[PDB]
């Protein structure tokens, strides 16, 4: 429920830098990141499996770096194939008799419950080999739901899954939590359920803590050119642009097209320099249908992947590096090579100093 | 390369009943379904590293279900990974090009430029225990890349990635299937990968094959309502109704609600009668708003998921037993208690028999 300077390394390869998490009692946490951050080791650290190069791990109230994994109120092991291939199913969840903690020996009747809600009912008797990748995976699940620990350690829990049965258990996982009360700890890739679950996102990023905060804080305000690049489904498009102008809550820019447009963004304005080279952000769903007016981009569209709910068009722009991205509602029928033009809201534009650094939008956005 | 009434059963319980597939050499199949449904064991049949019950499996074009795994041009790539512990990452991935007589030449060439896309280049000397589960995940993938086989089997081989991340593999593994020109056998639970790498998807259902089709061929017209069920994000909402009326190509039925509503649908009408009792759906992003459209559906807000790009809305309405889903973009405020209207659109409407076959839709839509 809490780390302070919690620095873990091995060799001149730093994992992790001083990251200081409050976790409040309770609350879900899921923590996600690039592909190497940081996330595993460091749920493992908050459990035992990882060793502590520096920092307290204040679980509960008092430290527990030295404290064996035994009891510290954990419960975590994870994703396809953790189970005792001699056991059963029902043996490999009903392992809840010693997992930090004081239950009975007639867990019968939760075993039985669990198995219900990750719809393994029917694989009871069943011996992991016998099981589909998906099917184990939620196996080692029940091993954790039915131990019931004072703060679960979730791993990616819900991987392996189809689209249906994967929306059914974030379901289970949420009254899971809104039940026991608990904390959680979740690890995920999966930006939806990041949302969805989360009451409270972690982003990690080469060890060091890039942000915290609520589920639309982070979508709305990254606090710099890296979360914002991160948070959100087909990554936000980022232009170069530079300073023209400078006044309290504006700061002009001027886009690299040909006609050189200029444009002022409600923001912070607080240590921007005039004539600076900055970094202008504008996500895919937030570009407009340019059938409006106003400030407005055109290229030759690159490529066009169909969804059936929406169609994300990829447009070339001159003096751009990479492609724009563009998602429209609905099958759109568009060609490569098609001339396409899009409008671009000065509201939903960040704008992120040399220095990556963000320029607190002041567009106030719901939530 | 081509399958035939094959069959698979592991004593009394048969995971494949006679499947015919027909994958055209160079082609981009996609297989999804259910976990457990036998998307694994498809595969692993096609490699070798199970036995066919019955049926038989042509990869080239010569029978080889008594071919050993070794020798059938097959490449595979599934979870369990193939990363040895005593090579390092470098080490790895060339370990494909053992017995193919590569020489340091032609190979460490090819193990250096894949060793790029995939993101690797600063990890060659590394090894598997010292990586993360992406890594490690996009190793496996370079092995099986380097090796460059005639046929690739890859089973979810973009799970433990970043969304950044993941959709850049999405181009580089796209990009490799235009290159080589090679047939590929994707598995996933990744929709949203599925609709845009596939050429074809293959729905596969408790051992069976439910439908084949192109992804916008799965998305508007599904052959029933188990893959109308199964294909689309939040699932498509069902509501029974009664058919009241057919006429040439129509079809009007009776919706639960109190005012006992009838609506014309643009269907099938093969096979329908008056009386029977039928599944209407309408999938979440086709409903549309309530001022803009006729035959409307008032009810409870249940659940508010705030995804940041879009809301998900669930209304309890009185008459059916499940929530019905809505999706409208952007953030929206609504309190977990409102009342909430939305309109039925009869064209975007399907319509399932009482066996849960699907009356074909006549409203063509864009693909
Ligand atoms: N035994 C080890 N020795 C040295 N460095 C290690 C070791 N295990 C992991 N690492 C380092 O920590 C980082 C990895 O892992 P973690 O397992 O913390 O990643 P994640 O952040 O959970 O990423 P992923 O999404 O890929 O699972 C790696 O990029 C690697 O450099
Ligand atoms: N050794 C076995 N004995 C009996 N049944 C088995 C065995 N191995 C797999 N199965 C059955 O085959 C089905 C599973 O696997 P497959 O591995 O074919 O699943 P998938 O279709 O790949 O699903 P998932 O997405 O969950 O990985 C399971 O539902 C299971 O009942």
Redesign the pocket.
């Known amino acids: 429920v809490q780390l302070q300077n919690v620095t873990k390394a091995?060799?001149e390869?730093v994992?992790?830098k001083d990251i200081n998490l409050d976790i409040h009692e309770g609350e879900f946490v899921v923590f996600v990141?690039?592909?190497?951050?940081?996330?595993?080791?460091?749920?493992?650290m908050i459990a035992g499996l990882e060793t502590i190069t520096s920092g307290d791990l204040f679980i509960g109230e008092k430290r527990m770096n030295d404290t064996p994994p035994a009891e510290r109120g954990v419960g975590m092991v994870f994703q396809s194939y953790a189970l005792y291939p001699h056991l059963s199913v029902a043996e490999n969840m009903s392992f809840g008799l010693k997992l930090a903690g004081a239950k009975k020996e007639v867990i019968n009747q939760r075993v039985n419950q669990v198995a219900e809600v990750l719809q393994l009912a029917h694989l009871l008797d069943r011996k992991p080999k016998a099981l589909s990748g998906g099917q184990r995976q939620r196996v080692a699940i029940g091993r954790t739901l039915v131990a019931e620990p004072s703060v679960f350690l979730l791993?990616?829990p819900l991987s392996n899954l189809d689209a249906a049965l994967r929306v059914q258990m974030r379901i289970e996982i949420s009254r899971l939590h809104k039940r026991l009360g608990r904390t959680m700890i979740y690890?995920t890739?999966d930006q939806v359920e990041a949302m969805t679950l989360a009451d409270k996102i972690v982003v990690?990023d080469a060890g060091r803590v890039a942000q915290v905060g609520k589920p639309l804080e982070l979508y709305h305000y990254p606090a710099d050119r890296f979360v914002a690049g991160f948070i959100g489904s087909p990554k936000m498009n980022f232009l170069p642009v530079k300073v023209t102008a400078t006044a309290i809550d504006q700061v002009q820019v001027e886009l690299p097209m040909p006609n050189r447009q200029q444009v002022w963004l409600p923001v912070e304005s607080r240590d921007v320099q005039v004539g600076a080279n900055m970094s202008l952000g504008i996500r895919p769903e937030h570009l407009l249908p340019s059938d409006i007016a106003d400030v407005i981009l055109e290229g030759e569209v690159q490529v066009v992947e169909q969804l059936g709910n929406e169609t994300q068009i990829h447009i070339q722009i001159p003096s751009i590096r990479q492609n724009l991205v563009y998602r429209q509602n609905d099958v759109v029928l568009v060609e490569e090579g098609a001339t396409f033009a899009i409008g671009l809201p000065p509201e939903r534009c960040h704008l992120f100093r040399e220095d990556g650094t963000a320029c607190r939008r002041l567009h106030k956005e719901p939530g």
């Not at 990141?33 to 493992?44: D, E, H, I, N, V």
């Open positions: 091995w060799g390869v994992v992790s990141g690039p592909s190497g951050c940081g996330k595993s080791t460091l749920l493992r791993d990616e690890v890739h990690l």
